[PDB]
Amino acid sequence: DIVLTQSPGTLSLSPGERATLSCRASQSVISYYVAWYQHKGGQAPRLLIYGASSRATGVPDRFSGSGSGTDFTLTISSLEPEDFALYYCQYYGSSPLWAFGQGTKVEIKRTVAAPSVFIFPPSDEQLKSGTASVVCLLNNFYPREAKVQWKVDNALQSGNSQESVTEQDSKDSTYSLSSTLTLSKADYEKHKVYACEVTHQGLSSPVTKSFNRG
């Protein structure tokens, strides 16, 4: 089956810069069947480039199509706030009939920001049910690449927590994360000290926020 490789998977720029989105195919495909799309999470995807080079109606002149053989490129001359979204390349004719790329993410490049870490103990109203939840808030940081580790009595726990990342803000252009550590009320009383270890690129040393039960 044909494999569409979109590079890079994450892209950081600013309005007015040149975006060079690539798309690699496993087989020497036909240029005439390559197409590019812009996907906004709120609505349906929009066709930008069809036939590798042709621009669809309503697509601004800044978008451009290029490529031949196995290397195809979508290039935006100068960026705009509306252009910051996801982009997909496609090819029709091989297996599967409609091949789709991975997903090139276009985000605004904010100056590096440090996450404001907060830890939340499980509420007593929740422990009455029979299950505890430990929330570790990471607020307003850049970039999105951040790692959260859970240490229970200075002992790491893996797989028992769930992360959640918000989208880049409209004004400050930062991200936020909320890793929720879920444990049983019987096992939450089995321990005493709980902490989440935050490691970010904009951190000189890994910050750890903790709390003692009771």
């Binding site: 020497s28 036909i30 240029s31 005439y32 069947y33 590798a52 004719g93 091989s94």
Partner: protein
């Protein structure tokens, strides 16, 4: 100019008109015939690659037959009949298609619909190619649909006649 070669392979057939391709005109295939209802579009349409080959083969068939062989395979004849046999811009169009990375016709493979019972055949349209590889069948499925629907509309008119 405009092509003017008229082919005639009506001898010993159910209806006058129509052309047949001998098993020596097709690679790894037996002989195939096409009805007069189909070849009639060759006298009208100025843009069918398969019609230009029919006039080219019917010329090759008649030239070898009705003219004594030259001493050393003279090319003087075909150079003066080329404009009356094919279309010089139909091949020039496929050049530009190939030049613009668009699937073109290299005049080798042709496809056509053929009914499973009544045996009615369509006019063979050219199978396109780009970077030396034929298009998959799914690349132009809607073209077959438009061509398969033309069969139904053309079938309707005979009963209406």
């Amino acid at each position: 100019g405009t092509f003017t070669w008229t082919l005639s392979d009506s001898e010993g057939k159910d209806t006058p008109g129509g052309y047949c391709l001998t098993r020596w005109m097709l690679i790894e295939a037996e002989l195939k015939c096409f009805g007069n209802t189909a070849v009639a579009k060759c006298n009208e349409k100025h843009d069918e690659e398969f019609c230009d080959m029919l006039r080219l083969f019917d010329f090759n068939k008649q030239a070898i037959q009705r003219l004594k062989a030259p001493a050393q395979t003279s090319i003087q004849l075909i150079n003066k009949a080329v404009n009356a046999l094919i279309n010089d811009q139909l091949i020039m169009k496929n050049h530009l298609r190939d030049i613009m990375c668009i699937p073109y016709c290299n005049y080798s493979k042709y496809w056509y619909l053929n009914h499973t019972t009544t045996g009615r055949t369509s006019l063979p349209k050219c199978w396109l190619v780009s970077n030396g590889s034929y298009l998959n069948e799914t690349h132009f499925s809607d073209d077959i649909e438009q061509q398969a629907d033309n069969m139904i509309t053309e079938m309707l008119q005979k009963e209406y006649m």
